[PDB]
């Protein structure tokens, strides 16, 4: 689970 | 524990705005967008974000300070659970939780 970059 | 009064609610609003203004609050202003974290809502049992907290404060949802603190704590604990410890998101949760604990000590 890796969130999208800002 | 005593119920929140209208005066206590002015303090909740103050603390919420201080968090919303913090430079490290950017991941938490609005609910997590599933397009940024596609499995998020299957992994995180009780999502929370500062906009949801603001709606709850405006509607006088919280009866006791403990319930407000529990919701705030979900924001930070959910972010640290979902993200790796070297992520910018995990860092923001650590900084903003420390700022919230400093502000909360004000309530006594």
From Swiss-Prot, chain A:
PTM per Swiss-Prot/TrEMBL: Acetylated as part of spermatogenesis progression prior to histone-to-protamine exchange. Demethylation is performed by JMJD6.
Compartment(s): Nucleus; Chromosome
N6-lactoyllysine: modified positions: 3
DNA-binding region: 3-6
Residue numbers carrying N6-crotonyllysine: 3
Modified residues (N6-(2-hydroxyisobutyryl)lysine): 3
N6-propionyllysine: residues bearing it: 3
Positions carrying N6-acetyllysine: 3
Coiled-coil ranges per UniProt: none
Organism superkingdom: Eukaryota
Description of how the protein assembles with itself and partners: The nucleosome is a histone octamer containing two molecules each of H2A, H2B, H3 and H4 assembled in one H3-H4 heterotetramer and two H2A-H2B heterodimers. The octamer wraps approximately 147 bp of DNA. Found in a co-chaperone complex with DNJC9, MCM2 and histone H3.3-H4 dimers. Within the complex, interacts with DNJC9 (via C-terminus); the interaction is direct. Interacts with NASP; NASP is a histone chaperone that stabilizes and maintains a soluble pool of Histone H3-H4 dimers.
Connected disease: Tessadori-Bicknell-Van Haaften neurodevelopmental syndrome 1: An autosomal dominant disorder with onset in infancy, characterized by poor overall growth, microcephaly, hypotonia, profound global developmental delay, impaired intellectual development, poor or absent speech, and characteristic dysmorphic facial features, including hypertelorism and abnormal nose. Other variable neurologic and systemic features may also occur. Tessadori-Bicknell-Van Haaften neurodevelopmental syndrome 2: An autosomal dominant disorder characterized by poor overall growth, microcephaly, hypotonia, profound global developmental delay, impaired intellectual development, absent speech, and characteristic dysmorphic facial features, including hypertelorism, abnormal nose, and wide mouth.
Role description: Core component of nucleosome. Nucleosomes wrap and compact DNA into chromatin, limiting DNA accessibility to the cellular machineries which require DNA as a template. Histones thereby play a central role in transcription regulation, DNA repair, DNA replication and chromosomal stability. DNA accessibility is regulated via a complex set of post-translational modifications of histones, also called histone code, and nucleosome remodeling.
Family membership noted in the UniProt record: Belongs to the histone H4 family.
Record-given protein name: Histone H4
Swiss-Prot record, chain B:
Domain Bromo: residue ranges: 3-107
Superkingdom of source: Eukaryota
Modified how: Phosphorylation enhances DNA-binding.
Protein localization: Cytoplasm; Nucleus
Tissue-by-tissue expression: Ubiquitously expressed, with highest levels in testis. Present in kidney, liver and brain. In the brain, highest levels are found in motor cortex (at protein level).
Protein's job: Regulatory subunit of the ATP-dependent NURF-1 and NURF-5 ISWI chromatin remodeling complexes, which form ordered nucleosome arrays on chromatin and facilitate access to DNA during DNA-templated processes such as DNA replication, transcription, and repair. The NURF-1 ISWI chromatin remodeling complex has a lower ATP hydrolysis rate than the NURF-5 ISWI chromatin remodeling complex. Within the NURF-1 ISWI chromatin-remodeling complex, binds to the promoters of En1 and En2 to positively regulate their expression and promote brain development.
Disease with which this protein is associated in UniProt: Neurodevelopmental disorder with dysmorphic facies and distal limb anomalies: An autosomal dominant neurodevelopmental disorder characterized by variable degrees of developmental delay, intellectual disability, speech delay, postnatal microcephaly, dysmorphic features, and mild abnormalities of the hands and feet.
Family: Belongs to the PBTF family.
Notes on the domains: The second PHD-type zinc finger mediates binding to histone H3K4Me3.
The protein's assembly and partners: Interacts with MAZ. Interacts with KEAP1. Component of the NURF-1 ISWI chromatin remodeling complex (also called the nucleosome-remodeling factor (NURF) complex) at least composed of SMARCA1 (isoform 2), BPTF, RBBP4 and RBBP7. Within the complex interacts with isoform 2 of SMARCA1. Component of the BPFT-SMARCA1 complex at least composed of SMARCA1 (isoform 1), BPFT, RBBP4 and RBBP7; the complex is catalytically inactive and does not remodel chromatin. Within the complex interacts with isoform 1 of SMARCA1.
Protein name: Nucleosome-remodeling factor subunit BPTF
Organism: Homo sapiens (Human)
Taxon lineage: Eukaryota, Metazoa, Chordata, Craniata, Vertebrata
Gene name per UniProt: BPTF
């Amino acid at each position: 689970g890796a969130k999208r970059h800002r | 524990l005593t119920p929140l009064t209208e005066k206590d609610y002015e303090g909740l609003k103050r603390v919420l705005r201080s968090l919303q203004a913090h430079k490290m609050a950017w991941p938490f202003l609005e609910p997590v967008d599933p397009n940024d974290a596609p499995d998020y809502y299957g992994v995180i049992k009780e999502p929370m974000d500062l906009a949801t907290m603001e709606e709850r404060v405006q509607r006088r949802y919280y009866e006791k300070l403990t319930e407000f603190v529990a919701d705030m704590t979900k924001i930070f604990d959910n972010c640290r659970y979902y993200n790796p410890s070297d992520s910018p998101f995990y860092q923001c949760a650590e900084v903003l939780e420390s700022f919230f604990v400093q502000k909360l000590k004000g309530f006594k």
